[PDB]
Amino acid sequence: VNYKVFIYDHIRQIAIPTTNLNSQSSLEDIIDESTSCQSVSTDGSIEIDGLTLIHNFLSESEESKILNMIDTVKWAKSKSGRRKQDYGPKVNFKHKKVKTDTFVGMPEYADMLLNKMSEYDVKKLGNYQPFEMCNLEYEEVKKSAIEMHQDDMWIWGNRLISINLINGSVMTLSNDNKSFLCYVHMPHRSLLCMADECRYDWKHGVLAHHIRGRRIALTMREAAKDFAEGGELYEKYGAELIRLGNIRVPLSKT
C-alpha cells in the first residue's frame, strides 16, 4: 500500500505513475487507467526490462483450435483455485531433482505458437526451446488466483510467456526493494513476456478480483542456461528434456 503505483502504456512501453490506482484497485479502474495513461506525461516514468505485451497475438480462429485441443485434454487440480494442464518435467525444486518419465512431449499448438513468436521478434521471443508449457485455468466463481511470486530460475529460463485465452486479466508486478507496484492490463488474445528485471527484480502475480469469468493462461517456459548445452545438468537431464520438448503430442482430431 505504501508503494508508488504505475500503469503500463503499451504504445510507449513505459510505466506512468498514478495516485488514482491503489493495492485494492478494481479491474475496471485499471483498464480505464490503461487508456488514460497515454495522455499522461513521461515524468516519473519507469522502463520495465523484458516486459513485452503483444495485443491481438492470436486470431479468433487460432485461439479456437488451441482451445478445442486444451479442453479435449484432461484438467488437473491445482492450489489457489487454479487448474493445470502440464507439458513439462516434474521437478523437486528443493532437492534439484528432475523426473522425465511423465514428459511425453510438447503440445501440437506449440509449433504454431513458437513460429509466430519468432515472426514478431526473433531476438525477443525467437530461439525458444520449450521445457514446460503449462495451461492454467482461473474461474472467478472459484476465486482463482496466483499469489505474488518469482518463478524458479534453476530449471526455468529468462523468458516467461503467458497468453490470455478465454478472457484477459491484469498482471500485478511488485519491486519490493524500490517500493514500486505496476499493473499491466493483459487483454484477450495477448502475449506477455516477463524477463530480465520482471523475472528476477520484480515479482509476478494475478489477483482474484482481476479475474472475470473463466481465463486460461498458456504459460510457456524455456531451458535454463545450465540445462542447455554448455551446462552442468545438460548431460544428466537437459539433453533428454530438449528432445522430449521437441516431440509434439497429437491433440487434434483430423
UniProtKB/Swiss-Prot annotation:
Q: What is its EC number?
A: 1.14.11.51
Report the superkingdom from the record. Eukaryota
| This protein's GO CC annotations | contractile ring; midbody; nucleus
Fetch the InterPro entries from UniProt: AlkB-like_sf, ALKBH4
Q: Which residues bind 2-oxoglutarate?
A: 136-138
Output the Gene Ontology terms for molecular function: 2-oxoglutarate-dependent dioxygenase activity; demethylase activity; DNA N6-methyladenine demethylase activity; metal ion binding
**Where is it localised?**
Nucleus
Would I find tRNA processing among this entry's keywords? no
Per the record, the similarity remark reads: Belongs to the alkB family.
Quote the disruption phenotype from the UniProt entry. Answer: Mutants lay fewer eggs.
Reported function: Dioxygenase that specifically demethylates DNA methylated on the 6th position of adenine (N(6)-methyladenosine) DNA. N(6)-methyladenosine (m6A) DNA is involved in epigenetic transgenerational inheritance. Plays an essential role in DNA replication and repair in the germline during meiosis. Binds to components of the DNA replication machinery such as top-2, and directs their localization to DNA to control DNA replication.
Q: Where is the Fe2OG dioxygenase domain?
A: 50-221
Report residues binding Fe cation. 149, 151, 204
Q: How is the cofactor bound?
A: Binds 1 Fe(2+) ion per subunit.
The upper taxonomy is: Eukaryota, Metazoa, Ecdysozoa, Nematoda, Chromadorea
| Primary location class | nucleus
- Subunit text: Interacts with top-2; the interaction is required for localization of top-2 to DNA. Also interacts with mtss-1, his-24, ule-3, C18B2.3, pgl-1, ceh-93, mcm-4 and F37C4.5.
What keywords tag this UniProt record?
Answer: Dioxygenase, Iron, Metal-binding, Nucleus, Oxidoreductase
**Catalyzed reactions per annotation:** an N(6)-methyl-2'-deoxyadenosine in DNA + 2-oxoglutarate + O2 = a 2'-deoxyadenosine in DNA + formaldehyde + succinate + CO2
Which cofactors are reported in the record for this sequence?
Answer: Fe(2+)
Question: What's the protein here called?
Answer: DNA N6-methyl adenine demethylase
Which organism's genome codes for this protein? Caenorhabditis elegans
The processes (GO biological process) annotated in the record are: actomyosin structure organization; demethylation; DNA replication; meiotic chromosome condensation; positive regulation of chromosome organization; positive regulation of double-strand break repair; positive regulation of egg-laying behavior; positive regulation of fertilization
